[PDB]
């Protein structure tokens, strides 16, 4: 178990997205699934020259799974999975950079929910979690879990939980009075009215 | 010179999109300059592990280049440049799920502005466009030539043009009915309507 230091930038933009007064939280799995979709279209271009690339799971998809008793909404993807590197590297993401922009946007009046256009979409899951713990198996590493309840760092180790032969899984913790994205009628309502074009299989697991 | 057939998909794709009855033309211009960014993001990523990705230019930017007298509007990016491989794969896309999405989602009520959503806004260059040559260099590839006149047919040769460093340059041989994109003013409008808020500078040249 390591325990490592968001960069500044990161950490300033989860704070802001922590402590900004912005009731619009839904878009949270818009952004999430959106990041699915860019993994699965990363694991299908490579397999389009190596076939072998999906000896680890031929089904490209995204699944919603609620969990009212651990009160978790877990988005779980077939897609290129992340490295130990991708995870310690922003998750895969340039968000240092991607910060800036973002940052930069804001104060051209742009508001929260354009975060996704500029690369950091993954960090919006605070908007509704107190807690995000990231399970991942990319072809070319382990099974590593990721976990951070923000203030300032965040930790990684080799999982030893069940394998999910490639892909990502964001376990979604959520704050308590968000418990709204656990039901089944929300949830759908979402994934309708901001995913509905997703070209990938989205399925809402009940319970 | 090697002449290549488009799979059949991307073949229907390109056919919609020059046949389809649709004003909304300057999309193109977000569409391109979108995929630049994309490109851009790939190269940043990589140097973040190996600073020596940028010994091919440091400088991540996108340049709109328009000439009168050729008839062209060029967009050139300091990206991730193309294989040659990438360049046969569709220019490093997944057009043949891209377009399949693309079209079930217009079954679905939705119009072709929103190519971009499915990964296949390289083609509405065609909604402009009566040739389009694409010129690339990746850092582990020599610098090739994309082109295609559309009717189920590109071509790829090694370039022996102006060698480039890094990148891809998008050249748009205008439709004579489309050159009101090679004004000034309309590039201008056209980047502050829909690219307003891309993470990396880009330039309008003059003539």
Same mark, same amino acid.
Not at 27 to 50: H, M, P, Q, V, W
């Given at each position: ?23 619009? =939280? ?26 072998? =690339? ?16 651990? #009160? ?93 032969? #490639? ?17 089944? #009628? #929300? ?21």
């Amino acid at each position: 178990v390591e325990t490592f230091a968001f960069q500044a930038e990161i950490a300033q933009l989860m704070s802001l997205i922590i402590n900004t007064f912005y009731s619009n =939280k839904e878009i949270f799995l818009r952004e999430l699934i959106s990041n699915s979709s860019d993994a699965l279209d990363k694991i299908r271009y490579e397999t389009l020259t190596d076939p072998s =690339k999906l000896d680890s799971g031929k089904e490209l998809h995204i699944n919603l799974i609620p969990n009212k008793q651990d #009160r978790t909404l877990t988005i779980v993807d077939t897609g290129i999975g992340m490295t130990k590197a991708d995870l310690i590297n922003n998750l895969g993401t340039i968000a240092k950079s991607g910060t800036k922009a973002f940052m930069e946007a804001l104060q051209a009046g742009a508001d929260i929910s354009m975060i996704g256009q500029f690369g950091v979409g993954f960090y919006s899951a605070y908007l509704v979690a107190e807690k995000v713990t990231v399970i991942t198996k990319h072809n070319d590493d382990e099974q590593y879990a990721w976990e951070s309840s923000a203030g300032g760092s965040f930790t990684v180790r080799t999982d030893t939980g069940e394998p999910m032969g #490639r892909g990502t899984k964001v376990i979604l913790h959520l704050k308590e009075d968000q418990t709204e994205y656990l039901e089944e #009628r #929300r949830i759908k309502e979402i994934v309708k009215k901001h995913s509905q074009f997703i070209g990938y299989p989205i399925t809402l697991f009940v319970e």
